[PDB]
Ligand binder design. Structure first.
Ligand SMILES: CCCCC[C@H](CC(=O)NO)C(=O)N[C@H](C(=O)N1CCC[C@H]1CO)C(C)C
Ligand SMILES: [Zn+2]
Length: 170
């Protein structure tokens, strides 16, 4: 199916994804389910932590046409500067909440793809924003954690009320 997307404040959003040991039948099903779940939501990124899988797996497609899929496995991201570029973000695990967040602007990304081909690229703008955001997810981090603790407290509430009306709707 398409999988449930976990929601703030669920404490399974804090689990530290463990790495992947090999690409088996299951991890391929999951990378495929996740793409569906991400395109369905809709969104441009997804970490396995968000659909209750604490494994270092990230899918992504940035295009308007929903046609440039990307698949990161045991990634590693290094900041190439202290020059944080601000960026209005939102999260599927944090619905209808948005504010500005500062992260490094230039970043190196290292990982393998679905078939295990290694790549190692240098990343700008939205790619570099998206990747850091999904990496945060794998290490139990939400973009609200970059905010003042009341602006996030109020976000525990806006979301809990949203989910209430998700449930009364479903
Ligand atoms: C820039 C951060 C991108 C992270 C990817 C997320 C998906 C997610 O919640 N992953 O953890 C997304 O598509 N979020 C969207 C989002 O934040 N957007 C829309 C596209 C880019 C960014 C601008 O607000 C939705 C929720 C509105
Ligand atoms: Zn998110």
């Amino acid at each position: 199916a398409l999988l449930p997307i976990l929601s703030f404040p669920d404490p399974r959003l804090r689990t530290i994804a463990k790495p992947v040991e090999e690409v088996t039948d299951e991890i391929r099903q999951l990378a495929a389910d996740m793409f569906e779940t991400m395109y369905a939501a809709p969104g441009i990124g997804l970490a396995a932590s968000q659909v209750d899988r604490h494994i270092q797996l990230i899918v992504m497609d940035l295009s308007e046409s929903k046609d440039e899929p990307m698949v990161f496995i045991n990634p590693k991201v290094t900041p190439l500067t202290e020059e944080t570029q601000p960026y209005e973000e939102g999260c599927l695990s944090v619905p209808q909440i948005y504010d500005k967040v500062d992260r490094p602007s230039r970043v190196k990304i290292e990982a393998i793809n679905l078939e295990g081909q290694a790549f190692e690229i240098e990343a700008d703008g939205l790619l570099a924003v998206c990747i850091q955001h999904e990496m945060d997810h794998l290490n139990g981090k939400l973009f609200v954690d970059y905010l003042s603790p009341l602006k996030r407290q109020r976000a525990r509430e806006k979301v809990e009320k949203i989910v209430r009306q998700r449930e009364r709707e479903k």
